[PDB]
Design a protein around this nucleic acid. Structure first.
Ligand SMILES: [Mg+2]
Ligand SMILES: [Mg+2]
Ligand SMILES: [Mg+2]
Ligand SMILES: [Mg+2]
Ligand SMILES: [Mg+2]
Ligand SMILES: [Mg+2]
Ligand SMILES: [Mg+2]
Lengths: 113, 151, 261
RNA sequence: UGAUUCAUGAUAACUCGACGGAUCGCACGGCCUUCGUGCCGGCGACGCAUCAUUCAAAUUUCUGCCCUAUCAACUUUCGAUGGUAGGAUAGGGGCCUACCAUGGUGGUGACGGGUGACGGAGAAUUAGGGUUCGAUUCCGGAGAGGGAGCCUGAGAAACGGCUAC
RNA sequence: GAAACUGCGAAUGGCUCAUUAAAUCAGUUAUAGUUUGUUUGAUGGUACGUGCUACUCGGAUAACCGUAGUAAUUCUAGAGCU
């Protein structure tokens, strides 16, 4: 029996997203996982694609039952490809990460040619 | 001592080895960029007119054109020239390298020689656009200068 | 040190940028530009910190490299551009125009304007003198240079410039009795009518201005700026019509706004 | 302009003149003069030089710094203070040179010495006044083991640049 | 498009307080006594033809290929290319 209300809501068709702060009310429940927020927020806004959403920066206030966060309704998944930081696409599975070992990455490579 | 021969006429190069004084005596006491007749320097180099040019020694320090001493002297150099192409060396920088003199002498290791003798519509559009832009600039001159004049 | 300083630290930033203290070590460091660069606002402050169309440095970079953000008739993709006083910042995709003015407490507001009062800007002149071949030209505090000046336009004056004809259409002669608004110091933001102007040989000229409702003050010449001839301005003033109100008065406004609801 | 032989113009010349575009992108798209990518043409990228702006720098005016008189004279032949002429600098200037003058600072503390002394915003304590501190994340200066000298460059006497001791 | 040429930045950042007591520094001036890549804005005739409308297009160089010295280092000579 948990609800979801959003404020500070503003549209930017410079980057064509719908950016807002969400103020979920989740009493009794410990906290509501973002993967579960996704489909509710999709089914209220009728986005036709529950993947343009990206939600981040939650707190779960002292005393519990009330949590803040940011939400970004993109309108085109193409727009969310180009206009987005990589890390949270990687988080939602839309890109993958690689590991570094910085020796010879540039230094002893600068020596030969 | 060991000599590189390369040819510019064809484009092939190999290396050989001489160890006879009365052959290399006429190789000695020459500067860089002078021809040497190979008849004496080897019976199978008749007609071939070598040119001694370049070459280094052991300890790897080359000779440099213009320095006349059978010795390893230290010089302040400029990058990109002979004997110094210090890569990624902060253009304008100089180093004091060690070099050999220009006259061949005893302590060398390898000597380099060569042989002298073997025995759009886009562009058109840019031109005419430049012309048009300048000829409209001058009309702007004659328009607004006189417009200010008549006051 | 041994050259130009290319980093700016947040505490060293101008006080009217409003930007917080634990927000980082560095500030946008407005690039060299057409306005005094201590009296300016980077377009990154215009976008991220005021309008919030983005949330990061890189998202503001996306904003500007999209070529949407157009300033003063021509798009400026620099992310530290020193936009300042009566620069007009337009956005075609939002069809939305802004003009940058001081508000009475010494800071910068983005006052919306419609297209007709966004087709042109308004700026003061630094000085008018001759150039090569005897052609006169004048210099503005926006840096702009205009050749063949109207033989009456003189120094310290104000001039309107359209963004298509890109020249003068009219000019306010800086003189006694025309509405001004100070652009620097503690009196900055306050509009008012010049009531006196006294000159002392070899020093800054002092301008005594009266606000629309009785208060009087003084200012140096480099800080004042005529807007319109007479009392009427030729620009849309912000929500406070250029009257700086005493702290007691502004407390009463908020008390009355509380007791009205 | 507060103030100029200023801004600037005309003239006579002068330079072995730095310069005054042999550069690179797409989108094509009106119409035949020889119907011939044909007459053509826009939007940019870079770049040369001048002025202004800006980022600055470098000089620079006035007033202000701790203890010490068991530090009362210091400066000046070899730059001390000034003048003239010049040289050099981006530029003023003893910055330097030639000549001339005999000046400059001081009991209102110069010069000298100490500083376990970078300066400031400031820190601790505080009835008031004060006392002591401030290497340190903000600003300015100075150094990159100690000195000295230079290349490139708009910007360096650079040291995560070079040369010598 | 990797390598490379060219251009630009590396003169910022950062660290420390050794030297330095009208010196640096603070407040306040001044540059009409100066330089300033860049930004931004404006700006630019004659290159020779006896001022009577432009008149001609150069190789070499790196990366590459190849032969090498040096025990050696973004040490280093030479040939062939573009
Ligand atoms: Mg520094
Ligand atoms: Mg002199
Ligand atoms: Mg000390
Ligand atoms: Mg510091
Ligand atoms: Mg240094
Ligand atoms: Mg040094
Ligand atoms: Mg180091």
């Amino acid at each position: 029996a948990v609800t979801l209300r959003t404020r500070k809501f503003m549209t930017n068709r410079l980057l064509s997203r719908k950016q807002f702060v969400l103020e979920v009310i989740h009493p009794g429940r410990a906290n509501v996982s973002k993967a579960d927020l996704k489909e509710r927020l999709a089914k209220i806004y009728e986005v036709k694609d529950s993947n343009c959403i990206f939600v981040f920066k939650f707190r779960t206030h002292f005393g519990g039952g009330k949590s803040t966060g940011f939400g970004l309704i993109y309108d085109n998944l193409e727009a969310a490809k180009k206009f987005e930081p990589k890390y949270r696409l990687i988080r939602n599975g839309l890109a993958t990460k690689v590991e570094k070992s910085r020796k010879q990455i540039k230094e002893r490579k600068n020596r030969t040619k | 001592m060991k000599l590189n021969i390369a040819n510019p006429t064809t484009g092939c190069q190999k290396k050989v080895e001489i160890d006879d004084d009365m052959k290399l005596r006429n190789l000695y006491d020459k500067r860089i960029s002078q021809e040497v007749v190979g008849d004496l320097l080897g019976e199978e180099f008749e007609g071939y007119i070598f040119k001694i040019m370049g070459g280094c020694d052991k300890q790897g320090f080359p000779m440099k054109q213009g320095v006349l001493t059978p010795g390893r002297v230290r010089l302040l150099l400029h990058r990109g020239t002979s004997c110094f192409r210090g890569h990624g060396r902060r253009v304008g920088e100089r180093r004091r390298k060690s070099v050999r003199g220009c006259i061949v002498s005893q302590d060398l290791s390898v000597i380099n020689l060569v042989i002298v003798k073997k025995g759009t519509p886009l562009t058109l559009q840019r031109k005419r656009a430049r012309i048009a832009d300048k000829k409209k600039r001058i009309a702007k001159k004659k328009s607004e200068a006189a417009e200010y004049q008549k006051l | 040190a041994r050259g130009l300083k290319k980093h700016l630290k947040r505490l060293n930033a101008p006080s009217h940028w409003m930007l917080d203290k634990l927000g980082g070590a560095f500030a946008p460091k407005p690039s060299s530009g057409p306005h005094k660069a201590r009296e300016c606002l980077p377009l990154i402050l215009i976008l991220r910190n005021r309008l919030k169309y983005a949330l990061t440095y890189r998202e503001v970079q996306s904003i500007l490299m999209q070529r949407h953000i157009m300033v003063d008739g021509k798009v400026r993709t620099d992310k530290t551009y020193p936009a300042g006083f009566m620069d007009i910042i337009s956005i075609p995709k939002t069809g939305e125009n802004y003009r940058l003015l001081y508000d009475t407490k010494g800071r910068f507001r983005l006052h919306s304007v419609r297209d007709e009062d966004a087709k042109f800007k308004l700026c003061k002149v630094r000085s008018v003198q001759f150039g090569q071949k005897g052609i006169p030209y004048l210099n503005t505090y926006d840096g702009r240079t205009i050749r063949y000046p109207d033989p009456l336009i003189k120094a310290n004056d104000t001039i309107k410039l359209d963004l298509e004809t890109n020249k003068i259409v009219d000019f306010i002669k800086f003189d006694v009795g025309n509405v001004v608004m100070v652009t620097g110091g503690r009196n900055t933001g306050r509009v008012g009518v010049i009531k006196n102007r006294e000159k002392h040989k070899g020093t800054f000229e002092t301008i005594h201005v009266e606000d629309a409702q009785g208060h009087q003050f003084a200012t140096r010449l480099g800080n004042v700026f005529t807007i319109g001839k007479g009392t009427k301005p030729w620009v849309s003033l912000p929500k406070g019509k250029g009257i700086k109100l005493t702290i007691i008065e502004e407390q009463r406004k908020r008390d009355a706004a509380a007791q009205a609801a």
